[PDB]
């Protein structure tokens, strides 16, 4: 079940009421919101895109920080087993929470090496008029509570707790966070370097791919692929609409996206028309694009 201050969380319940009734949750939200956004470099960084999963442990000599950004209606979820330090960061967008939460639990439960407990952290979203952030909170908290293992909710800064306003337009306060694998510290972060195959991985998400695990902790390898998707519908119609038309239909929050969001969409849409059948083309021998950290902490092809 899902525990807070040692007691089971009653559902359904808004995260605002849950945070208001438990001082440790309220304190954590105040600290996280009051932080300045840290510009995290690429050294030892494993950036997690939307609808992606990454899990590692402090025994990893290549990954120091897991991070994700550009969360408007989605939620960044961090599951950590204290003691052994097995840490999993996912960027959930409400596509299939019934299957994504077991993916998070199995990524951590596979680490056998009593000591410590399971702690979960939920950050992201705002008071969007489509209610996508509130439904993701309801879904994530419900499926974590259905697990048989005791999961202790430590961080909860979602929806109305993560909402700011600027001339009657609402948008998130925290767009992204980073987690230090060794010290378990979570903080607001921005990422200028977001790893290799960004457009290929963004196209896989735009085409409708499910949540995937992108990192193999044993070999310390970033494995990208092989991917296969159906041709995106009307790629040239969407590529020729104006920036307002693209935000209203291809984004979940047309007025809350970070700047240059339409630049990223058009780049992603051009990739899908460039590669409608990518399985046999971008992956030679049906093998994944494997990357490893090098001496300077940057991803390099192997």
């Amino acid at each position: 079940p899902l525990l807070v201050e040692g007691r089971r969380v009653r559902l359904p319940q808004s995260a605002g009421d849950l945070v208001r009734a438990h001082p440790p949750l309220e304190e954590r939200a105040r600290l996280l919101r009051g932080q300045s956004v840290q510009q995290v470099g690429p050294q030892g960084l494993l950036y997690v895109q939307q609808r992606e999963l990454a899990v590692t442990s402090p025994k990893d000599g290549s990954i120091s920080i897991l991070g994700s950004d550009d969360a408007t209606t989605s939620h960044i979820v961090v599951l950590r087993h204290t003691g052994n330090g097995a840490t999993c960061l996912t960027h959930c967008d409400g596509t299939d929470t019934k299957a994504e939460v077991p993916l998070i639990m199995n990524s951590i439960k596979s680490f056998s090496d009593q000591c410590g407990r399971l702690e979960v952290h939920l950050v992201g979203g705002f008071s969007d008029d489509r209610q996508l952030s509130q439904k993701l909170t309801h879904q994530l908290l419900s499926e974590f509570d259905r697990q048989e293992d005791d999961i202790h909710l430590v961080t909860l800064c979602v929806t109305e707790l993560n909402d700011r306003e600027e001339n009657e337009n609402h948008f998130p306060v925290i767009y992204g966070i980073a987690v230090n694998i060794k010290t378990a510290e979570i903080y607001r972060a921005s990422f200028q370097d977001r790893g290799p195959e960004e457009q290929l991985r963004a196209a896989r998400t735009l085409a409708g791919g499910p949540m995937i695990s992108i990192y193999d902790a044993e070999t310390e390898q970033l494995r990208i692929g092989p991917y296969s998707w159906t041709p995106f519908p009307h790629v040239d119609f969407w590529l020729h609409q104006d920036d307002k038309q693209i935000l209203e239909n291809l984004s979940t929050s047309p007025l809350a996206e970070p700047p240059h969001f339409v630049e990223h969409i058009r780049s992603t849409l051009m990739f899908l028309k460039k590669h409608p059948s990518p399985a046999h083309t971008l992956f030679s021998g049906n093998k994944a694009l494997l990357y490893k950290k090098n001496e300077d902490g940057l991803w390099e092809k192997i």
Binding site: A71, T73, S74, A202, G208, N249, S251, T252, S253
Partner: peptide
């Protein structure tokens, strides 16, 4: 975020 990316929509449907």
């Amino acid at each position: 975020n990316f929509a449907a």
